């Protein structure tokens, strides 16, 4: 308890220091060469710093589209959080800046690809392999929640696999500092907790629900609630019924029934013992939490890539201009970025 307590207290101290005085305008666009679009309010591009030669993933957001999609506060949230957190399984923000048209967040490039692609290629992960990844998310959420941060977009698409086979969580677009509840409708349909769908004020229990969805999808190859159209998914989510493939262990089913509890007041991670109801569950009996945190556990696989500039594990997107207008757009809205 004291080892963890003092760790988290220091982690919060250091977060709050950066949080109170965010960094701003720490590079500019022409410091980088554009290489390739890695994903698509904006997109993520692989770039190369012209002086150091280091590769980064540059998230580019169109200010005007951010305004129209009502994402102003969310983009400010994302940048402020990324520049203030520090944890082994969180993508590292190196620079941020803005110009007349766009907002830029420049992160260390993780060349191994998204867990999503690997999971669809292999079909499903074994339970040990799912558990290895799950354990990192548990520790990451323990860290974030102790900072009064909610994440709100857990899914394999946002979990990058790094050079050692470990996770780096990316995309903090929906993350937010919350000491009580919050109300915004956001997330991804298959991963939305019932109380989000039902337009309630909700809290960090939604991250533990999403972990339930993630573990199920990793171990089954399919998420627990799916349908042709999102509206049909939502009805399944709120129904309170989930079926498990027969190959799931009894321990896994028991953990998932407790994470995928529709009643947020009964959901693991949100009970009196918090995250320890999850960490102490039989399904994690073999998990060495410290060895995971120290990255001393052999990973299920090391992604195949040729070097720090290799884009092989990402797919191919239409290569569009980075348009920068001659006139400043939305200056007042993003003064603080």
């Amino acid at each position: 308890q004291e080892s963890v307590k003092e760790f988290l207290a220091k982690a919060k101290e250091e977060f709050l220091k950066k949080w109170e005085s965010p960094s701003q305008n720490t590079a500019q666009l022409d410091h980088f060469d554009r290489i390739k679009t890695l994903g698509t309010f904006g997109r993520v591009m692989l770039v190369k710093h012209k002086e150091t030669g280091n590769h980064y993933a540059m998230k580019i957001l169109d200010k005007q589209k951010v305004v129209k999609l009502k994402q102003i506060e969310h983009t400010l949230n994302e940048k402020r959080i990324l520049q203030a957190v520090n944890f082994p399984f969180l993508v590292k923000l190196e620079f941020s800046f803005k110009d007349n048209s766009n907002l830029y967040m420049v992160m260390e490039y993780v060349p191994g690809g998204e867990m999503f692609s690997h999971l669809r290629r292999i079909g499903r992960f074994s339970e040990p392999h799912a558990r290895f990844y799950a354990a990192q998310i548990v520790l990451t959420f323990e860290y974030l929640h102790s900072l009064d941060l909610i994440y709100r977009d857990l899914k394999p698409e946002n979990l990058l696999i790094d050079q050692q086979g470990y996770i780096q969580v990316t995309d903090f677009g929906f993350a937010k500092r919350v000491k009580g509840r919050t109300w915004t409708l956001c997330g991804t349909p298959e991963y939305l907790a019932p109380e989000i769908i039902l337009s309630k004020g909700y809290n960090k229990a939604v991250d533990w629900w999403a972990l339930g969805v993630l573990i199920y999808e990793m171990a089954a190859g399919y998420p627990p609630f799916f349908a042709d159209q999102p509206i049909q998914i939502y009805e399944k989510i709120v129904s309170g019924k989930v079926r498990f493939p027969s190959h799931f262990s009894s321990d896994l089913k028991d953990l998932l029934r407790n994470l995928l509890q529709v009643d947020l007041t009964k959901r693991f991670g949100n009970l009196k013992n918090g995250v320890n109801d999850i960490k102490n569950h039989k399904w994690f009996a073999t998990t060495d939490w410290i060895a995971i945190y120290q990255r001393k556990v052999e990973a299920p696989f090391i992604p195949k890539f040729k070097g720090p500039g290799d884009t092989s594990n990402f797919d191919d997107y239409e290569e569009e201009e980075i348009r920068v207008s001659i006139n400043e757009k939305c200056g007042k809205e993003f003064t603080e970025f």
Binding site: E157, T188, Y222, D228
Partner: peptide
């Protein structure tokens, strides 16, 4: 179950 997931079509990257 897994075949029904494939049948949904929603096996690609999911947007927010």
């Amino acid at each position: 179950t897994y075949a029904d997931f494939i049948a949904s079509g929603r096996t690609g990257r999911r947007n927010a």
